[PDB]
């Protein structure tokens, strides 16, 4: 339709590429030294914040189809821009995890940090967990973008990143914290095992819609 | 216009619910390793930061009856709004603890975090520690949301959240860090562990009160006369 | 009058700073504190204190910072003496309360300042010199009046400065940067081994910093 | 203005000095006190934060030859001040490293592949690291971004933190050739030294190119537009 549209879609592609790459690659490589829950959370959150700043101003930095449909409820995002955004997000995620697999060594590929069931908890409980996780994430993103709220420079990005960090604390203790269908799809399509993939591709979306409607109809309607 | 009041009470309920959720759920689950002190303090701090961000701009996000009483002395003056806010914080807290029990497996149920007197610390020492914790938190909150700092907000949610993180370092080293009567009332009811449950309901409260009093009289009062 | 409210604000700021600082820096036998945990303690502490009492009276929380500002930005000599006095009093009283509330088996030494993993004295004097140098540099360049048209994140920035200075300075000695924070545990426990280095290390550094930032880095 | 230039190059020298001091300092290998990766990334990131604030407001705070070349391509910078900045960065870096040897009982934080697998492609890892770093640095300071004022010294700092997570896991994270040069120059371990110097540079440039030709080209002035139209 326009040129800024193409720059926006490309910014989303590169965004989810760097996010999946830096995230999965940050959490994965465990030699004698070992990454921690708070360390991985700091990784995913900090990456989300950084990309949200830069590409943030170009295209909004959704880096997530769940916040793309939760934004389709009321971010002035068209269904065409929705299709192109989720397309660039899926392809960018798969390209990021794939490039990671190409640059990462061979002893440590392991599970490529695929989210799944942890510590024996049925699928409904994980669905509820992801529901609340992406619910608070979507609440934070819709709050840090409400252009009628005074803010200092760069505080919204840090707040969204820290939200991803907290959601990675609890969500990491339950199902590795999905919060993003592309972030859980990319390592699967790179390495396999679609086991318990329905929770992820369902978890955030429910919450998304919920959260979205909330902040647009029950919490702070315009 | 009571629909804004209803959105406010609902925001208090949902916000306290999420706070108890992420707080306890991220505080107890210790299957493989242990929960690091900085990890729990970061959990509560970043959670309160996020809620104060969103439902902070919607409702102020007290997420705390003690901050509600301190606000009753300071932010406003004598309000059934403070009353209803207390009620919604209680409901949201207990509901969040129960929902946490159901979403979790009956595996790392543990104590559900009834932060008891640890490392051989007495009761009065605990009420004093918690008194100072909620003192510094109430100070930070009253300073961030002051009409004298309304020109540019400047990281209110981040400053408050990090304040909660520090208070969680010290308090966690003492009695698990309360800083919230509802947060201590929910899991003690859901799991039935009532060992030492008056300290917090006494520690924070007066502490918060003291804070308000200080910040409203010995520190920075309203202008006594417009001459200065 | 309002002056007295300011020096009371400094007294309270140092009270809570030393209390929370040494309290979180204490070595508890159920969860060994990490370097990042103590750095976060002091960092976030001075952060929120600088928020509130930074709104009130600048929140120095450091006699060395009060001296650096004395050279720097028109501060009355009696305000500096009263600030340093209230900071020392708040420090010793806060550490005293921490000593009163904490059990005996865990109050190992209230996090006294002692060099470790070998090292001399002047080496600590120049390490601490550079630590307080960067601290006062960030503090001055984050509370500038002729820059006030553009603010920023002053409290968070100063706090995280204290945090990194606590990473390196903790790996060397425990990161002083503050004579009151180093003096209160001393008075509480009569352990004064190589205590003068700090009273000289940070201090002189701050001075340098001030002069530098005001006379070389950004002269009028 | 002839003095403000010297203030700029001197602020660059001092920024690189203290930066290297704290980075390698907290990055040292202490006995019975194993520093965690997040502590290293926190040290470097917060250091970049305070230095980018302090001097950042003084002299823009490059503290990095890679971003100095990047700003030679984009942020309105001549070759003279760029070269002088680079010299100040190298000199300040080796000075800080030497001082850290003056404060260290007798490997100095200099980076090299620790894990021993897929070395050159790790050079590509450096490419992407400085890609995201330069992207965040460019978009942190854009008038078009608005948001009342800009530059959160924090914006650049936390970017450096995450980059330091991934890099520390791979090749200790270069992102800054002076940092990778000083302790090596004072420590005969030049193993795969061409990696680092090549990693950021390429990366940085690409980032600039993207942010200046693909993502958000700058609003050209008429006087420069006449230079591209001649």
Residue numbers in the entry:
A (entry chain C): 5 to 226
B (entry chain A): 5 to 232
C (entry chain D): 7 to 226
D (entry chain B): 5 to 110, 115 to 238
Sentences from the paper on this structure:
Here, a new method of on-chip crystallization is reported which allows the efficient and reproducible growth of large numbers of protein crystals directly on micro-patterned silicon chips for in-situ serial crystallography experiments. Crystals are grown by sitting-drop vapor diffusion and previously established crystallization conditions can be directly applied. As a consequence, ‘naked’ crystals are obtained on the chip, resulting in very low background scattering levels and making the crystals highly accessible for external manipulation such as the application of ligand solutions. Serial diffraction experiments carried out at cryogenic temperatures at a synchrotron and at room temperature at an X-ray free-electron laser yielded high-quality X-ray structures of the human membrane protein aquaporin 2 and two new ligand-bound structures of thermolysin and the human kinase DRAK2.
We collected serial diffraction data for on-chip crystallized human aquaporin 2 (hAQP2) at room temperature at LCLS using the fast-scanning Roadrunner II goniometer. From two Roadrunner II chips we obtained 3377 hits from 137 476 collected frames (a 2.5% hit rate), leading to 2723 indexed patterns (an 80.6% indexing rate). The rod-shaped hAQP2 crystals showed a strong preference for two distinct orientations rotated along their long fourfold symmetry axis when lying on the flat silicon-chip surface. The corresponding diffraction patterns collected with a beam perpendicular to the chip plane hence show a strong bias and Bragg peaks only cover a very narrow region of reciprocal space. In order to obtain a complete data set, we tilted the chip by 25° during SX data collection. Each monomer contains a water channel surrounded by six transmembrane helices and two half-helices forming a pseudo-transmembrane helix. Despite the limited resolution of the data, clear density for a water molecule is observed in the middle of the water-conducting pore of one of the hAQP2 monomers, close to the conserved NPA region. Therefore, the weaker diffraction properties of the crystals used in this work are most likely to be owing to their significantly smaller size compared with the crystals used for previous structural determination and do not originate from our on-chip crystallization method. The hit rates of 2.5% as observed for hAQP2 on the Roadrunner II chips were low for a fixed-target experiment and can probably be attributed to the low protein concentration that was used.
